[PDB]
Short mmCIF file of C-alpha atoms in Angstrom, two decimals:
data_model
loop_
_atom_site.label_atom_id
_atom_site.label_comp_id
_atom_site.label_asym_id
_atom_site.label_seq_id
_atom_site.Cartn_x
_atom_site.Cartn_y
_atom_site.Cartn_z
CA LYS A 1 84.09 124.52 94.05
CA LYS A 2 83.84 123.49 97.68
CA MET A 3 86.48 120.72 97.39
CA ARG A 4 89.21 123.23 96.65
CA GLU A 5 88.42 125.61 99.49
CA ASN A 6 88.06 122.66 101.88
CA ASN A 7 91.50 121.39 100.85
CA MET A 8 90.11 117.92 100.14
CA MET A 9 91.65 117.73 96.66
CA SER A 10 95.16 116.99 95.47
CA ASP A 11 97.07 119.80 93.78
CA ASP A 12 97.83 117.66 90.72
CA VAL A 13 94.48 117.84 88.91
CA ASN A 14 94.23 120.71 86.42
CA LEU A 15 90.72 121.32 85.19
CA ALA A 16 91.64 122.26 81.61
CA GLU A 17 92.62 118.76 80.51
CA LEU A 18 89.45 117.35 82.06
CA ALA A 19 87.43 119.86 80.07
CA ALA A 20 89.40 118.78 77.01
CA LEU A 21 88.81 115.06 77.46
CA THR A 22 85.03 115.17 77.90
CA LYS A 23 84.00 115.83 74.32
CA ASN A 24 80.26 115.13 74.15
CA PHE A 25 79.49 115.07 77.87
CA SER A 26 76.25 116.82 78.69
CA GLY A 27 75.84 119.05 81.71
CA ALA A 28 74.26 116.24 83.71
CA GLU A 29 77.11 113.74 83.31
CA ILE A 30 79.88 115.73 84.98
CA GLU A 31 78.35 115.35 88.43
CA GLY A 32 78.35 111.58 88.04
CA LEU A 33 82.02 111.79 87.16
CA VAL A 34 82.62 113.64 90.43
CA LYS A 35 80.64 110.97 92.25
CA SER A 36 82.63 108.10 90.78
CA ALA A 37 86.00 109.72 91.48
CA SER A 38 84.93 110.23 95.07
CA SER A 39 83.71 106.65 95.24
CA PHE A 40 87.12 105.38 94.21
CA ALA A 41 88.90 107.49 96.79
CA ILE A 42 86.54 106.53 99.60
CA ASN A 43 86.53 102.82 98.72
CA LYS A 44 90.31 102.94 98.88
CA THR A 45 89.89 103.42 102.62
CA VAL A 46 86.96 101.28 103.67
CA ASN A 47 87.54 98.13 101.58
CA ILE A 48 83.95 96.99 102.00
CA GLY A 49 83.76 93.29 102.75
CA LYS A 50 86.92 91.33 103.48
CA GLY A 51 89.22 93.82 105.18
CA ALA A 52 86.58 95.51 107.29
CA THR A 53 86.94 97.70 110.38
CA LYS A 54 90.06 99.57 109.21
CA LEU A 55 88.25 102.88 109.75
CA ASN A 56 90.26 105.20 111.97
CA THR A 57 90.98 108.88 112.41
CA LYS A 58 94.38 108.80 110.69
CA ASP A 59 92.97 107.37 107.46
CA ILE A 60 90.10 109.84 107.16
CA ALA A 61 92.19 112.77 108.36
CA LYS A 62 94.15 113.10 105.09
CA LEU A 63 91.66 112.12 102.39
CA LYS A 64 92.41 113.66 99.00
CA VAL A 65 91.20 112.79 95.52
CA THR A 66 93.81 112.08 92.86
CA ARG A 67 94.01 112.51 89.11
CA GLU A 68 94.21 108.79 88.40
CA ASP A 69 90.88 108.41 90.19
CA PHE A 70 89.33 110.62 87.51
CA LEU A 71 91.11 108.66 84.81
CA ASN A 72 89.70 105.47 86.29
CA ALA A 73 86.29 107.10 86.59
CA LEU A 74 86.16 107.74 82.85
CA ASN A 75 85.63 103.98 82.41
CA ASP A 76 82.32 103.94 84.31
CA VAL A 77 80.50 107.02 83.02
CA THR A 78 79.93 107.06 79.26
CA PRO A 79 78.47 109.76 76.98
CA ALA A 80 75.02 109.34 75.49
CA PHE A 81 75.30 111.55 72.41
CA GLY A 82 78.93 110.68 71.72
CA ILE A 83 78.16 107.13 70.60
CA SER A 84 78.99 107.29 66.88
CA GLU A 85 82.53 108.66 66.96
CA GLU A 86 83.40 105.46 68.81
CA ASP A 87 82.93 103.73 65.48
CA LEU A 88 85.40 106.17 63.95
CA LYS A 89 88.15 105.46 66.43
CA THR A 90 87.62 101.73 66.12
CA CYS A 91 87.78 101.95 62.33
CA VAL A 92 91.56 102.43 62.55
CA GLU A 93 92.26 99.67 65.05
CA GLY A 94 94.27 97.92 62.33
CA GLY A 95 96.78 100.76 62.65
CA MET A 96 98.21 103.09 60.07
CA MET A 97 101.47 102.68 58.19
CA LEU A 98 103.34 104.89 55.75
CA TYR A 99 104.80 102.26 53.42
CA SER A 100 104.36 104.71 50.52
CA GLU A 101 104.80 108.39 49.82
CA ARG A 102 101.31 108.54 48.31
CA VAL A 103 99.48 108.33 51.64
CA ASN A 104 101.22 111.46 52.91
CA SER A 105 100.23 113.46 49.84
CA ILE A 106 96.61 112.36 50.16
CA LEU A 107 96.47 113.19 53.86
CA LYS A 108 98.01 116.60 53.24
CA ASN A 109 95.49 117.35 50.51
CA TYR B 1 95.25 80.15 125.82
CA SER B 2 95.60 83.42 123.93
CA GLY B 3 99.40 83.38 123.78
CA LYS B 4 99.92 86.99 122.66
CA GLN B 5 96.56 88.77 122.12
CA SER B 6 95.84 89.39 125.79
CA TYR B 7 94.43 92.94 125.59
CA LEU B 8 91.38 94.52 123.98
CA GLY B 9 92.35 96.76 121.08
CA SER B 10 88.86 97.80 120.03
CA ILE B 11 85.57 96.72 121.60
CA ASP B 12 82.12 96.98 120.00
CA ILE B 13 79.13 97.05 122.33
CA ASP B 14 75.43 97.07 121.47
CA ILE B 15 73.55 99.38 123.83
CA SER B 16 69.85 98.81 124.53
CA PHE B 17 67.30 100.06 127.02
CA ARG B 18 66.75 97.46 129.72
CA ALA B 19 63.20 98.76 130.30
CA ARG B 20 61.09 99.88 127.34
CA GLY B 21 59.07 102.30 129.44
CA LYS B 22 62.27 103.98 130.64
CA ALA B 23 63.28 105.34 127.23
CA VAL B 24 64.66 108.86 127.71
CA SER B 25 65.75 111.23 124.95
CA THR B 26 68.95 112.51 126.58
CA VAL B 27 71.96 112.91 124.30
CA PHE B 28 74.46 110.32 125.54
CA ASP B 29 78.17 111.12 125.27
CA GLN B 30 80.17 108.16 123.96
CA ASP B 31 83.31 109.24 125.81
CA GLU B 32 81.46 109.31 129.13
CA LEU B 33 79.94 105.90 128.41
CA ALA B 34 83.37 104.44 127.66
CA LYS B 35 84.75 106.03 130.81
CA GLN B 36 81.83 104.59 132.77
CA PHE B 37 82.44 101.10 131.42
CA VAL B 38 86.16 101.30 132.19
CA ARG B 39 85.77 102.77 135.68
CA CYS B 40 83.17 100.16 136.62
CA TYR B 41 84.92 97.33 134.77
CA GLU B 42 88.70 97.41 134.34
CA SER B 43 91.21 94.72 133.36
CA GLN B 44 88.31 92.28 133.03
CA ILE B 45 88.31 89.45 130.51
CA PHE B 46 85.58 89.68 127.88
CA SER B 47 84.20 87.39 125.16
CA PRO B 48 81.74 87.84 122.28
CA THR B 49 78.06 87.46 123.25
CA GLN B 50 78.88 88.17 126.90
CA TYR B 51 76.16 90.30 128.48
CA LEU B 52 76.26 93.06 131.07
CA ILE B 53 73.94 95.40 132.99
CA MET B 54 75.12 99.00 133.06
CA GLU B 55 74.04 101.81 135.40
CA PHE B 56 74.75 105.25 133.91
CA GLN B 57 73.28 108.28 135.68
CA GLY B 58 70.60 106.06 137.19
CA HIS B 59 69.65 104.55 133.83
CA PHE B 60 69.88 100.78 133.43
CA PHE B 61 71.00 99.38 130.07
CA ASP B 62 71.70 95.94 128.64
CA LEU B 63 75.09 95.71 126.91
CA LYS B 64 75.92 92.92 124.46
CA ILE B 65 79.50 92.59 123.25
CA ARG B 66 78.86 91.86 119.59
CA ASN B 67 82.46 91.22 118.59
CA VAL B 68 85.94 91.56 120.05
CA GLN B 69 89.33 92.57 118.64
CA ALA B 70 92.23 91.10 120.62
CA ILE B 71 95.72 92.60 120.20
CA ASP B 72 99.01 92.06 122.03
CA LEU B 73 100.96 94.90 123.63
CA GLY B 74 103.46 96.46 121.25
CA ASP B 75 101.31 96.19 118.11
CA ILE B 76 101.43 99.70 116.64
CA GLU B 77 98.70 98.98 114.08
CA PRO B 78 95.41 97.08 114.61
CA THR B 79 96.19 94.56 111.88
CA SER B 80 94.39 91.86 113.89
CA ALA B 81 91.09 90.75 112.41
CA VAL B 82 88.04 91.44 114.55
CA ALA B 83 86.70 88.00 115.46
CA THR B 84 83.00 87.27 115.77
CA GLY B 85 83.86 83.84 117.16
CA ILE B 86 83.25 83.57 120.90
CA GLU B 87 86.67 81.96 121.43
CA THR B 88 88.55 85.25 121.19
CA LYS B 89 88.78 87.00 124.55
CA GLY B 90 90.82 89.83 125.96
CA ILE B 91 91.55 92.05 128.93
CA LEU B 92 90.19 95.58 129.09
CA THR B 93 92.50 98.58 128.99
CA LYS B 94 91.89 102.32 129.34
CA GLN B 95 92.67 102.88 125.62
CA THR B 96 90.35 100.42 123.86
CA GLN B 97 88.41 102.03 121.02
CA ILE B 98 84.87 101.54 122.30
CA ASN B 99 82.20 101.73 119.60
CA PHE B 100 78.61 101.78 120.86
CA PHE B 101 75.90 100.59 118.47
CA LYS B 102 72.14 100.99 118.68
CA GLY B 103 70.29 97.95 119.95
CA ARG B 104 67.87 95.95 117.85
CA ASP B 105 65.09 98.04 119.37
CA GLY B 106 67.00 101.19 118.40
CA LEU B 107 65.81 103.62 121.09
CA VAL B 108 69.12 104.65 122.65
CA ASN B 109 70.03 108.13 121.39
#
């Protein structure tokens, strides 16, 4: 809520697709997602460790979160109830091929 | 000796109370402190671990240059690494970014 009115967020993110992606997320996971996305954006500036001391007004004066930060953030937070469908998507890692008509008929049925 | 980096781009100074019993809770303005340091000490060559005694509004403080960032005139960006090594020295200018840090005692407000 506050991000948008404080103009701290890029215009590219559309909430609908986010709501689509997060299948089995509970209510308490979304906030962590927000946290991680912010962490990526903020780390982009400070670069803790090696390249220290780059902090300056110009950098912090135009901070905005980006969609790819959310996409990256999906790799840190993981559902807790959505742990079994993972098996289902990995069951077809071998791929699917349509070498025969028959498969199409079966799938249609 | 320096070749090019003859000026102080940013300077970081640890501020401490000289006298423990003279701790006073006044809110100290960083800008005024920087101005005080420049007006009292201008175009002076400074090194890491160099010490100084500072008289601000009758209050006596011990100042310890923790690290120094030397930059040459004409450098738009502060790409220079801040050196903790005492070898790096530079000449004060009225535009150095002066960051004041609490002393080890941590009483300066």
